[PDB]
Amino acid sequence: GEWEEIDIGPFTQNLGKFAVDEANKRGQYGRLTFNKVIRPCMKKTIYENEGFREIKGYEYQLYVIASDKLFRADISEDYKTRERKLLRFEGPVPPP
């Protein structure tokens, strides 16, 4: 399986902040205030399909508490540029 649990240290918390910033732009929940990312944070690596199967990027699934509510965010991150995209941000979700 290509998903693996990663740490919820500062880089992951900053991913959650990105997710909340992007969720605020989408506005589905109105303005939210990032609180923290909780376990589990899952990452999967996306590879090119052919050639050297270079890593194309990553996808993360995060559980982020924002405005005291728990959301699940899916975030892509390009390997070469570090460009992140919020793919999904939903909740309030059950605690994982």
Curated annotation (Swiss-Prot):
InterPro entries, sorted: Cystatin_sf, Monellin, Monellin_B, Sweet-Taste_Mod_sf
Blocking, abolishes the sweet taste, annotated site positions: 41
Keyword NAD: no
Technological use: Natural monellin has not been mass marketed to the food industry, primarily due to the challenge of large-scale purification of the protein which is relatively sensitive to heat or acid treatment.
Pfam families attached to this UniProt entry: Monellin (PF09200)
Keywords from the UniProt entry: Taste-modifying protein
Keyword Chloroplast: no
Job of this protein: Taste-modifying protein; intensely sweet-tasting protein.
Subunit structure of this chain's protein: Heterodimer of an A chain and a B chain.
Protein name in the entry: Monellin chain B
Protein species of origin: Dioscoreophyllum cumminsii
